[PDB]
Write an enzyme that holds these catalytic residues in place. Structure first.
Site, short mmCIF file in Angstrom:
data_model
loop_
_atom_site.label_atom_id
_atom_site.label_comp_id
_atom_site.label_asym_id
_atom_site.label_seq_id
_atom_site.Cartn_x
_atom_site.Cartn_y
_atom_site.Cartn_z
N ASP A 266 9.82 -6.71 2.56
CA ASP A 266 8.88 -6.26 1.52
C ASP A 266 8.79 -4.75 1.40
O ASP A 266 7.78 -4.23 0.93
CB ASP A 266 7.48 -6.80 1.82
CG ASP A 266 7.44 -8.31 1.98
OD1 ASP A 266 7.91 -9.02 1.06
OD2 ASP A 266 6.92 -8.79 3.02
N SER B 3 6.73 0.48 0.69
CA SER B 3 6.06 -0.71 1.20
C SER B 3 5.50 -1.45 0.00
O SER B 3 4.46 -1.08 -0.53
CB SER B 3 4.93 -0.35 2.16
OG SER B 3 4.29 -1.52 2.62
N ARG B 4 6.20 -2.50 -0.42
CA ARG B 4 5.94 -3.13 -1.70
C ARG B 4 4.54 -3.67 -1.88
O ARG B 4 4.01 -3.68 -3.00
CB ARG B 4 6.96 -4.22 -1.98
CG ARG B 4 8.27 -3.63 -2.34
CD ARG B 4 9.21 -4.68 -2.77
NE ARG B 4 10.56 -4.24 -2.49
CZ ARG B 4 11.64 -5.00 -2.64
NH1 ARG B 4 11.51 -6.25 -3.07
NH2 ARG B 4 12.84 -4.52 -2.35
N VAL B 5 3.94 -4.12 -0.78
CA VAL B 5 2.54 -4.55 -0.74
C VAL B 5 1.63 -3.43 -1.29
O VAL B 5 0.59 -3.70 -1.89
CB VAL B 5 2.16 -5.00 0.69
CG1 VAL B 5 0.65 -5.19 0.83
CG2 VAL B 5 2.90 -6.29 1.05
#
Lengths: 128, 265, 48
Positions: free
Chosen positions: A94, A119-121
């Site tokens: 992610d 950090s795709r979150v």
């Protein structure tokens, strides 16, 4: 780790490192005489990791909100992120923290490449 | 390392090399223009300057440093700033006016309080009397130039196309012109301030003379600079092309091995 | 207006359709800017 996740607690897991795991998996396969694929790895060397890292998750309420968080490590050679197994795992996770020797020696430590790191979150999991 | 890496690095330099060489012919071209500016200002330098020799003119100080805004021209700004610095010990209380940014940058790293005015956007076209005169107009106004007992022009003197020579020359004010030893060798009409005019005209003129030579010196340095850049850029290209071909060949062999290994079973 | 400037006006009126070449025009145009300097910072940039 999943015991904690499954029973409403939180666990972090660090796979240090999956570069070496794939090399082992290749050894198994070659000696079992499973006809190899790219760079002699098994054809399903991506699935090896993809099913592993899919097990890290945040569970629902009906499942007690427990979680497993994975930090897998990958080794590159000569900064080749475009290599075979690096490419796989990047498409699994992610987001990536990217470390550079060139930064290490300019004094930048942790040697994180901000340009390349994500950090795709995102800011959903950052203190307000 | 990887063909894709070596492909871009080789192609990057392949451009720098064509770049520097285009800027080496742009220099050579601009050099015919350069001697029409040097010679035509070194002759106006004999004639303008000769009065002062015969009248025997001699003399808080005002330094005017002259180079340009543009790099890629060897050690033009480096050693000129070195001549100004060397001179600046013998009188640290000088007031500096900088013509060109590259020279301003150099002296700002070493004598920032001494710099009171910076002239900008210079290195492009050849120096003209208008720039010369309008800078002069600023010195007289903002710097109050006419009041300094000492004014100096630092600039590069082009001895040839192969090397230059950081130089200096003085500009005398009205007081000093008047009071010179042989000023009464000339039937000067004592009326409407001629020393005043002769000073303010010579202030523009000898600046232009300086710029015109510094220009010429820079163009001939930039040429020689680009000439070696192109030489090295081109020599690197050979070593990288050689590396490319190895890495190309290696990519074919290694793919061929995978395919042969795969069929082997 | 300084004597050099005085002479510019006259010299550039001695300019201001043909006989008005490239380097002739480009003697009537200056890209230069001045910036005053103190303590170094500056007194904001202005055309010459």
């Amino acid at each position: 780790g999943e015991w904690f996740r499954d029973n409403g607690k939180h666990a972090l897991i660090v796979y240090d490192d999956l570069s070496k795991q794939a090399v082992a998996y290749r050894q198994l396969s070659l000696l079992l005489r499973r006809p190899p694929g790219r760079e002699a790895y098994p054809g399903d060397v991506f699935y090896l990791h993809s099913r592993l890292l899919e097990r890290a998750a945040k569970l629902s309420e009906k499942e007690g909100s427990g979680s497993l968080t994975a930090l897998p490590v990958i080794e590159t050679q000569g900064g080749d992120v475009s290599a075979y197994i690096p490419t796989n795992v990047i498409s699994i996770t992610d987001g990536q923290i990217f470390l550079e020797a060139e930064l290490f020696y300019k004094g930048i430590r942790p040697a994180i490449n901000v340009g390349l790191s994500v950090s795709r979150v995102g800011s959903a999991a950052q203190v307000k | 390392a990887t063909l894709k890496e070596v492909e871009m690095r080789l192609k990057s330099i392949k451009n720098i090399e064509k770049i520097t060489k285009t800027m080496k012919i742009v220099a050579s071209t601009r050099l015919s223009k350069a001697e029409k500016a040097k010679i035509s200002a070194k002759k106006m330098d004999e004639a303008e300057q000769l009065f002062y020799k015969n009248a025997e003119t001699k003399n808080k100080e005002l330094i005017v440093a002259i180079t340009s805004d543009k790099g890629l021209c060897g050690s033009i700004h480096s050693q000129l700033a070195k001549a100004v610095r060397r001179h600046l010990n013998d009188q640290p209380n000088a007031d500096i006016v900088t013509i060109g940014d590259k020279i301003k940058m150099q002296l700002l790293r070493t004598h920032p309080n001494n710099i009171k005015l910076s002239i900008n956007g210079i290195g492009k076209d050849a120096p003209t009397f208008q720039e010369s005169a309008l800078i002069a107009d600023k010195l007289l106004s903002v710097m109050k130039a006419g009041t300094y007992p000492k004014i100096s022009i630092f600039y590069n003197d082009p001895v040839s196309s192969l090397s230059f020579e950081p130089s200096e020359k003085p500009i005398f004010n009205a007081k000093t012109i008047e009071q010179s030893p042989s000023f009464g060798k000339f039937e000067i009409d004592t009326d409407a301030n001629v020393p005043r005019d002769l000073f303010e005209y010579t202030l523009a003129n000898q600046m232009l003379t300086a710029m015109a030579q510094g220009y010429a010196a820079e163009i001939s340095a930039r040429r020689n600079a680009m000439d070696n850049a192109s030489k090295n850029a081109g020599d690197m290209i050979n070593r990288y092309s050689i590396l490319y071909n190895r890495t190309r060949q290696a990519v074919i062999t290694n793919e061929l091995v995978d395919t042969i290994t795969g069929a082997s079973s | 207006i300084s004597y050099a400037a005085y002479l510019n006006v006259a010299a550039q009126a001695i300019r201001s359709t043909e006989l008005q070449t490239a380097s002739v025009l480009n003697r009537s145009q200056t890209d230069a800017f001045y910036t005053q300097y103190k303590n170094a910072s500056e007194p904001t940039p202005i055309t010459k």
